[PDB]
Structure 1
């Protein structure tokens, strides 16, 4: 067998059947004789390729395979990898290298010091020392991406390697099963459970690794048992809990003082599947108030190490959530009461308030819709106004890096063909990965893109307001026609200048047979 044949067999035997890519000459020897059981998803720029693959992996809860062109292609995707690192996304990023005979002279297309390029944003980064090592290296990449804590990995392969003879002993790679589905030992788990049972006023904080593990339902059971309020950890990349469940208390503000104030009076706070904490704004104060102790369950040693407070347990979120939910006592305390419905903001016949947009989406979208958020000044209102009952219903750029949601929404829709994906994206954010629209058109992936057009980098204008910062340049983005951009890439386009038009546009989009972009004129 050739290295080509052996590698594709390894991939299929490990459950991989799709290649997200933007091709180049170093990659042609890999892509030639493309297996008929594989499919290739092309995107026009590498931030888009990786974004689509990211959404696909996160929604599918399995590794996604990417093929990029050398250094330039890898480099174009680096911003996307920053998000993927923060969301623990299992991405196998492969990049083609020059033929081994031409690497020394640094011919055009040589990826110099390749393994160092994507660092520090990958778990593992490697170029094999020989062609016959390629399948083994790929095996390592697959497992490194897939083991908790999941994350992106990088493999560079000289283009001449593919046609070489493979090592017959590579067959041992094909069916390897590697598990990190582990939980705390019985003795210490019993101690934790007793601490939870004995809490007088427990609180629960959930992060994205809960949704990644599909531990949502187990966490619901856990919260019901403990009769505990449930918060989502700040800067949330995913939604780990039904947002209209009586225990739900919403998204935590990303501030030290704000969070300790919120947790005041809670004697035990159990954090599951989140960093402690992904703060953002400067908000100095106490990490925790006197009387509050914190216990964190995390799949990532790096999270456990850097928490400034509390105890920590490093284990699989799925296994831990299931164990806790089934071991804790049913508290005799009263179940928390559901949060009241959000108020309806006054809305005239003119430009749309973001609150109106979200209320309308919630009214019209299917109960199993999936939302993506890259409307950076409206996040708080979005979280308050969308009823998300099911797992996998929300994605937001995990490192705050714009250019995620547009392509990721396409990958999510590919992963979940029966769930309507609706991406809500600011006019500023929409530009970073605008060319991703073409992939939705070409493959007829019926994502709905809602562009919130207020003509400015609104979040930045706000922050600049609090800083009292004057004379800041570059905050306005006037003069973009999003319907024209959609037309450019073959996506049906609608405009909503008022509520009447928004309702009409959504009705049309929800019944369309392909992707649709709606440009919404917002305050």
Structure 2
């Protein structure tokens, strides 16, 4: 067999059936004779390719396979890889290299020092030393992406490798099963369970790896047994808990002092599936108040190492959440009471308050909708106003890198065809990966895109005011017609200048058979 045939057999045997790509000449010898049981999803720029694949991987809870063109294509995708690193997204990024005979002269399209290009944003990065090594290197890539802590990996392959003969002993790669589904040993787990049972006022903080593991329901049981309030760790990439469950307390503010103040009086704080903590704003103070002990369960040694406080356990989130939820005692304390609904912001017949938009989406969207957020000044309100009952219902750029949500919402929708995806994206954010719209049109992936148009980089204006920073350039983005951009890429387009039009547009979008973009005029 050839390296090409062996490699595609490895991919299929390891459950991969989709290639997210933007092709080039170094990749044509890989993409030729494309197997009939695989699907190719084209996107028009590599940030879009990787964003789509990322949303697909995150929602599918399985690795996604990518093929990019050499150094320039890889480079175009590196902002998307910054997010994928922070979300632990299991992405297998492949890129074609020049033919081995012309690497030394650095012919056009040579990826120089290729393995160093995507560092430090990948778990493993490699170029094989021979063609017959390619299947083995692909095996390594699959497993490195997929083992906890999951993350992106990179493999560069000289284009002449594919047609060469494979090692027949590569068959041993096909069915390898690699597990990291591990939990704390019984003796130490029993210590932890006793500390939880003995706590007088426990709190739980959950991060994105809970949702990645589909540990949400186990965390509900854990919270119910401990009678404990539940927060989402700051800068949240995913939603790990039902947002109208009585224990839910919302998104933590991303500040040192604010978090220690919130946790004051909680004697044991159990963090699961989050870094400790993804702070953002400068908010100096105490990491924890006297009287609070923190225990973190994390899938990532890097998280455990860098936590400034608390004990940690490095283990699989799914395995630990299940064990804890089934081992703790039922506390006799009263169950926490549900947070009240948010207030209705006064809304005239003009431009929409973001609060109005989120309330209307919550009113009209199906109960199993999936939301993406890249409306950076409105995150707090979004988290308060959307009832997200189910796992896999929320995504936000995990490194804060704009250009994620538009393509990722297409990947999520591809992963979950029965669940209506609604991406809420600011007018600034929408441009970074605007060309991703075309993939939704071409493959008829019926994502709804809600563009929050207030004409400015509103989160940055806000911050400039907290800095009392005057004369900052570049904060306004006037003059973008998002209906015209959607037309440009073949997506049905609507406008909402007031609440009546927003409801009419959403009704239309929800019943459409293809992707739809709604440009909403929001208060500046």
TM-score of the two chains, using structure 2 as the length reference: 1.00
Deviation at 1:190, TM superposition (A): 0.1
Deviations 1:316-340 (CA, angstroms, capped at 9, x unpaired): 0000000000000000000000000
Deviations 1:189-242 (CA, angstroms, capped at 9, x unpaired): 000000000000000000000000000000000000000000000000000000
Deviation at 1:416, TM superposition (A): 0.0
Q: Structure 1: how far apart are the matches of 2:33 and 2:184?
A: 47
Deviation at 1:304, TM superposition (A): 0.1
Q: Structure 2: how far apart are the matches of 1:466 and 1:50?
A: 34
Name the residue aligned to 1:258: 258
What root-mean-square deviation, in Å, do the aligned CA atoms of Structure 1 and Structure 2 show?
0.1
Runs of 4+ off more than 4 Å: none
Deviations 1:10-34 (CA, angstroms, capped at 9, x unpaired): 0000000000000000000000000
Q: Structure 2: how far apart are the matches of 1:231 and 1:334?
A: 18
Deviations 1:285-337 (CA, angstroms, capped at 9, x unpaired): 00000000000000000000000000000000000000000000000000000
Q: Structure 2: how far apart are the matches of 1:184 and 1:23?
A: 44
Q: Structure 2: how far apart are the matches of 1:475 and 1:186?
A: 55
Q: Structure 1: how far apart are the matches of 2:137 and 2:291?
A: 50
Q: Structure 1: how far apart are the matches of 2:509 and 2:153?
A: 37
Q: Secondary structure of 1:59's partner? A: helix
Write out aligned runs for 1:145-160 (5 A).
145-160=145-160
Deviations 1:241-265 (CA, angstroms, capped at 9, x unpaired): 0000000000000000000000000
Deviation at 1:6, TM superposition (A): 0.1
Deviation at 1:43, TM superposition (A): 0.0
Q: Structure 1: how far apart are the matches of 2:290 and 2:34?
A: 62
Deviations 1:172-204 (CA, angstroms, capped at 9, x unpaired): 000000000000000000000000000000000
Deviation at 1:37, TM superposition (A): 0.1
Deviation at 1:80, TM superposition (A): 0.1
Q: Structure 2: how far apart are the matches of 1:305 and 1:393?
A: 30
Q: Structure 2: how far apart are the matches of 1:496 and 1:310?
A: 48
Q: Structure 2: how far apart are the matches of 1:168 and 1:420?
A: 45
Q: Structure 1: how far apart are the matches of 2:205 and 2:299?
A: 15
Deviation at 1:50, TM superposition (A): 0.0
Q: Secondary structure of 1:428's partner? A: helix
Q: Structure 2: how far apart are the matches of 1:485 and 1:168?
A: 51
Deviations 1:364-393 (CA, angstroms, capped at 9, x unpaired): 000000000000000000000000000000
Q: Structure 2: how far apart are the matches of 1:166 and 1:255?
A: 54
Deviations 1:439-459 (CA, angstroms, capped at 9, x unpaired): 000000000000000000000
Deviation at 1:516, TM superposition (A): 0.1
Q: Structure 2: how far apart are the matches of 1:491 and 1:208?
A: 31
Q: Secondary structure of 1:53's partner? A: helix
Deviation at 1:72, TM superposition (A): 0.1
Q: Structure 1: how far apart are the matches of 2:336 and 2:507?
A: 36
Q: Secondary structure of 2:105's partner? A: coil
Name the residue aligned to 2:35: 35
Q: Structure 1: how far apart are the matches of 2:248 and 2:355?
A: 20
Q: Structure 2: how far apart are the matches of 1:37 and 1:291?
A: 58
Deviation at 1:53, TM superposition (A): 0.0
Q: Secondary structure of 1:358's partner? A: helix
Q: Structure 2: how far apart are the matches of 1:168 and 1:328?
A: 51
Q: Aligned residue pairs: how many?
A: 523
Q: Structure 1: how far apart are the matches of 2:331 and 2:104?
A: 68
Deviations 1:135-157 (CA, angstroms, capped at 9, x unpaired): 00000000000000000000000
Deviation at 1:418, TM superposition (A): 0.1
Q: Secondary structure of 2:151's partner? A: coil
Q: Secondary structure of 2:339's partner? A: coil
Q: Structure 2: how far apart are the matches of 1:466 and 1:23?
A: 45
Q: Secondary structure of 1:25's partner? A: coil
Deviations 1:81-137 (CA, angstroms, capped at 9, x unpaired): 000000000000000000000000000000000000000000000000000000000
Q: Structure 2: how far apart are the matches of 1:461 and 1:174?
A: 53
Deviation at 1:462, TM superposition (A): 0.2
Deviation at 1:514, TM superposition (A): 0.1
Name the residue aligned to 1:213: 213
Q: Secondary structure of 2:26's partner? A: helix
Write out aligned runs for 1:40-439 (5 A).
40-439=40-439
Q: Secondary structure of 2:157's partner? A: strand
Deviation at 1:65, TM superposition (A): 0.1
Q: Secondary structure of 1:371's partner? A: strand
Unpaired runs of 5+ residues, structure 2, are none
Q: Structure 2: how far apart are the matches of 1:203 and 1:168?
A: 55
Q: Structure 2: how far apart are the matches of 1:205 and 1:137?
A: 38
Deviation at 1:165, TM superposition (A): 0.2
